Amino acid sequence: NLDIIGKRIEKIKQEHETSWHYDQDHPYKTWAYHGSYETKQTASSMVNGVVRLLTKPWDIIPMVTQMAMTFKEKVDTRTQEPKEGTKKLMKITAEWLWKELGKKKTPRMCTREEFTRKVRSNANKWKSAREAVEDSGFWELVDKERNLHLEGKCETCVYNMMSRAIWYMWLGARFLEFEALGFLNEDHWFSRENSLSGVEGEGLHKLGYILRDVSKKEGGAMYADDTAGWDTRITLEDLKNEEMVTNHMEGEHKKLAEAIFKLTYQNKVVRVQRPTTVMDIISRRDQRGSGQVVTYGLNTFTNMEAQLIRQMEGEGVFKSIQHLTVTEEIAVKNWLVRVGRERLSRMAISGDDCVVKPLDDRFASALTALNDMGKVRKDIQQWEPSRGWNDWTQVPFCSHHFHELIMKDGRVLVVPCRNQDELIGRARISQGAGWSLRETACLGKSYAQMWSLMYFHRRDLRLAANAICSAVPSHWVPTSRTTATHEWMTTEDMLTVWNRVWIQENPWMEDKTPVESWEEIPYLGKREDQWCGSLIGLTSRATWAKNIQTAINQVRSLIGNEEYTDYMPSMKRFRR
Ligand SMILES: NC(=S)Nc1ccccc1OC(F)(F)F
Ligand SMILES: [Cl-]
């Protein structure tokens, strides 16, 4: 309590001394409440006109158009403390898992240099973050806080709250987080090669092949249970097992990392905007509140831990969670040593998302440890057995499913897919306002190149991608605002990138013969394409395709007299 957060609280109070008020109508039961002060402020989603003008048939599909319009009673919930046997299972598994992750990696601090480059390449006292990073005063502020963290105290590391709640901090706090824990992401601790379960850095053109590799293992069904609000179910016991990564560290780094875990993760200060408009200063020990990048790595870690323990329960390694006998600890430790690495290779885990191919289907009803850790499954009754998948091509993972697609030359592509309304509806949205026509067109082109690389097998997305790349000046560079490896972010010719990604660099493709034209590159079956949302067969789509050069010319006239390429003859029906 207040020893560790008092300074932070004391400091906020005194910047708003003409405001402080201990409110008695504060809506917090689960968040500790401290006080309030005066404010008044809010970003919604704007439509990308280039993408929308080249996707006219979708103007009348509610699933597309509704996406561009428009439970916080989950953050104000509380998870019980796991039983003593659960806590032992978690501590033993966590200790073993950090050791395995650390075998071929060295923890290390990340630098002002690395941080500075990252804000400049794009990943109130100053305007943008770009500015603060050049001003040497900022870095004096960082040093002040840093020396405080070496003392075991904190002054400025305060969360600002905004199934999506986002906890921004001031850039200095993010730096200190990155300094201490950036190695997890920067040095690929959750890569598949290092962690066996992980997919960090793998890319959407790899995830399907990875699921197919898991399918080749002897075992039962594939299970893909989502957790209901994963970030809100992270226990103080989880935060303490995550902190054990500091056991692998040394000198100053060890102390900087311990200070991030103790002072910002296992104790938290948050400012929240309440309309009735005051800023509320609340605290709590548990739940997830790191930066999005550290959150991903620690989510992956704890998910790997929970899923190994669920697999232990299904194999009958332990009998009850209430208490672990001495021999049961010996059996758990010996299971980890003997088959831990084989059991990790049976999973694909991306933060809170997982796919497990267990040894057999006893896993489906092994629910005691999972429920007691507070990782309660979404949209199924607490004690109802999981429904597994019999076909890897139907398993959901990272918002996708995966098709097996045979090329006219017999080589096998495993391709990512989702409902086409979701893909078109997202490409029609721009984040933030103040965008020029040119910037809006370059965001359109980023989507079009992504579709050509990942979704080429969808007849409507190949045609719309060609139309957008034909309508945007040939040499304009694709742009974004929140950058999964992104090979579509380039001015290189998309056929050449396709060959690099799908043939040359694809470790599941033995024959390295380049593809010479887009017509060698196959589609889904026409019925599968319709099943996944295609408009092929509709009159609205036939008129769109047939008259596509008129939509292209409409966007060219708006942008003006620039150099354009016609990509439409890369498709058979337009090749005259
Ligand atoms: N990506 C996250 S969560 N933090 C971070 C790490 C390294 C550089 C910058 C970053 O902070 C910023 F994006 F807020 F600026
Ligand atoms: Cl199935």
Ligand SMILES: [Zn+2]
């Ligand atoms: Zn601090």
Ligand SMILES: [Zn+2]
């Ligand atoms: Zn599909």
